[PDB]
């Protein structure tokens, strides 16, 4: 049964490849050669947020852009005030290891995931007293790699035992589960309409997931290694993925295959995070040789290098209005770039 | 209004800074340890007033490459072992030759003293006579024990360069305490560039 089913899968994958190849008419470079390039704009460090002790593993901006949340490994979750470099709230963490942090679009909830398999939700308003754990989502059996909010009530989480899950807070149970990959789901990003979330895993697979349905519509296999971090193009029609083979690839949703690949011979280190600018002409990628090369998104050129850090950059965030870029590295410094 | 909010923000920022100072003091007092043979189990103890938080992975899937990278900050990894021995050797080599684990010292424990079939290099082996065999035992057990220790040493010496060290031991808390003190003293000598 295995041999005939394997033959059928081989035939069908060949059909999907042939169909994508027939739909492939050009590369993005051929048509977009006639555009003015960015040239070079280097950025200047403007703020330096030094309050952490251990390495800063994840940072998340807020929709207000006044405030950012950063999570270290010393068990401290700190809500910085990026304009006036002050610490609004510092929160103690029950478990030392925290691999992600998420900040709500209302600015009332902060979600931190660790190795302890328990997503925690912190209420910020708290007229009774301090910020405190309110409800904790404990369903996964691997670890929790990334987490994101859809609204104040429902939170999507990417586990490390292959099952992405959609969570409800006031009940506490998984509304739905996503079971597509064969690997550790590293990072998920959300579309700007918040109906579809891409998933990055360790089997070099990018998948498109529908939130209400719970099925993977598409599969993007163009990487040679695991996908560290994934970011949508800011309209919701494409996305970029970062891997450990020193390639950032731009994947198209509706043409279903890779538009462009950002890789140069002098780069032999893994991408840890990818992000876009406001318009999307600039692609920001954190690299493992301690700097953040900036990529011209339509021309595949290196616009500039953000070389302020001293250790591995772990997280990289861009504000909603696009004013600044804040990178976080393992030397316990958040550098805000303009 | 503005004066009140700035003064209040100064007070809140100073209170948070003082809390971070207290946390820094207790954090530096703490020597984290990793034991690899609820997603994570914590064992806390203290030997001569020095606090050791030891963490053991709980229900973690067997693929190890992603989550281990977080553990580079640790002082030492306690590695306990018992064709199982070859898998343990391959694991130790992977930990030793990682791009991020070059600063962590590995502390090695040889539990369940042993076999002979899997290693046709064992027949050509002689006991290290610089070392002192522990009395009241079996010559074959001693020969096998030192043979396994030598295999771990040969894996260790490949591109070691003094960045991090491997300590081999036999079966427990005092041994870990002495080894952690040794690692800290070597790290301090490296800072002053005496070594």
């Amino acid at each position, epitope marked *: 049964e295995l041999d005939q089913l394997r033959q059928e899968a081989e035939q069908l*994958k060949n059909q999907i*490849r042939d169909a994508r190849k027939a739909c492939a008419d050009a590369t993005l470079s051929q048509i977009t050669n006639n555009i003015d390039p960015v040239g070079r704009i280097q950025m200047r460090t403007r703020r330096t947020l030094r309050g952490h002790l251990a390495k800063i593993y994840a940072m998340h901006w807020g929709t207000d852009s006044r405030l950012l949340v950063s999570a270290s490994q010393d068990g401290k979750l700190i809500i910085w005030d990026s304009y006036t470099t002050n610490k609004v709230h510092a929160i103690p963490l029950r478990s030392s290891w925290v691999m992600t942090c998420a900040y709500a679009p209302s600015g009332n909830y902060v979600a931190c995931g660790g190795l302890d398999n328990i997503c925690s939700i912190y209420n910020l308003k708290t007229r009774e007293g301090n910020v405190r754990v309110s409800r904790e989502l404990a369903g996964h059996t691997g670890y929790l790699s990334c987490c994101r909010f859809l609204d104040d009530n429902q939170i999507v989480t990417s586990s490390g035992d292959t099952t992405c899950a959609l969570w409800d807070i006031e009940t506490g149970q998984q509304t739905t589960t996503f079971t597509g990959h*064969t*690997g550790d789901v590293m990072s998920l990003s959300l579309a700007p309409d918040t109906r579809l979330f891409v998933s990055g895993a*360790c*089997d*070099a697979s990018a998948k498109l997931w529908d939130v209400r349905e719970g099925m993977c519509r598409q599969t993007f*296999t163009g990487h*040679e*290694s*695991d996908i560290n971090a994934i970011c949508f193009f800011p309209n919701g029609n494409a996305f970029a993925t970062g891997s*450990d*083979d*020193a390639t950032c690839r731009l994947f198209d949703l509706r043409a279903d295959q890779e538009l462009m690949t950002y890789s140069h011979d002098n780069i*032999i280190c*893994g991408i840890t995070s990818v992000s876009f600018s406001k318009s999307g002409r600039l692609l920001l990628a954190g690299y493992d040789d301690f700097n953040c090369n900036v990529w011209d998104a339509l021309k595949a050129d290196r616009a500039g290098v953000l070389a302020g850090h001293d250790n591995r950059v772990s997280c990289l965030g861009v504000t909603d209005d696009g004013m600044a870029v804040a990178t976080g590295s393992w030397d316990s410094f958040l550098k805000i770039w303009n | 209004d503005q004066r009140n909010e700035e003064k209040a923000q100064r007070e809140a920022n100073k209170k948070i800074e003082k809390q971070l100072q207290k946390d820094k003091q207790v954090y530096r007092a703490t020597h984290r340890l990793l034991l690899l043979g609820s997603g994570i189990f914590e064992t806390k103890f203290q030997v001569d007033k020095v606090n050791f938080h030891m963490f053991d992975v709980g229900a973690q*899937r*067997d*693929e*190890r*490459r992603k989550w281990i990278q977080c553990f580079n900050d640790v002082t030492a990894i306690i590695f306990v072992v018992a*064709n199982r021995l*070859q*898998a343990a050797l*391959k*694991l130790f*080599d*992977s*930990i030793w*030759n*990682n*791009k991020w684990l070059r600063d962590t010292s590995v502390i090695l424990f040889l539990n369940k003293q042993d076999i002979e*079939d*899997y*290693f*046709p*290099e064992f027949a050509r082996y002689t006991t290290p006579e610089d070392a002192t065999p522990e009395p009241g035992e079996d010559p074959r057990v001693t020969r096998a024990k030192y043979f396994i220790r030598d295999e771990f040493l040969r894996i260790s010496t490949a591109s070691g360069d003094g960045r991090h060290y491997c300590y081999p031991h036999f079966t427990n808390i005092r041994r870990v305490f002495n080894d952690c003190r040794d690692i800290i003293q070597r790290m301090h000598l490296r800072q002053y560039e005496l070594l």
Partner: nanobody
Amino acid sequence: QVQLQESGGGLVQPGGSLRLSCAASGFTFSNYKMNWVRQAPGKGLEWVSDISQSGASISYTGSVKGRFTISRDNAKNTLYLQMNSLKPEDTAVYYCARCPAPFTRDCFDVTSTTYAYRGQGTQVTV
């Protein structure tokens, strides 16, 4: 799309010179330290041999010393295993595998719970 295919195997007279060939498609071959992993039936996966990025660093399991030869060519991008003087108790499925990152030395691919980049294997009966 990354897949490792294996050609060879089958019944062999004990002692027979059977060769296993792994064909790599979907990645740059010259950058990955590629290894062979075998699963005996009713037994977890066990590493056999590995060869480095160039073809200089070669290592074996203790039980397969001096009987198995591992050689890699970059141009035909194939991981080639030569087995000589076989034994009936060492019969197993043989999986071609790839260590997950370029330009590195460490590997984490003994894991039976579906490592993402190994091949599907060939039964090899002695």
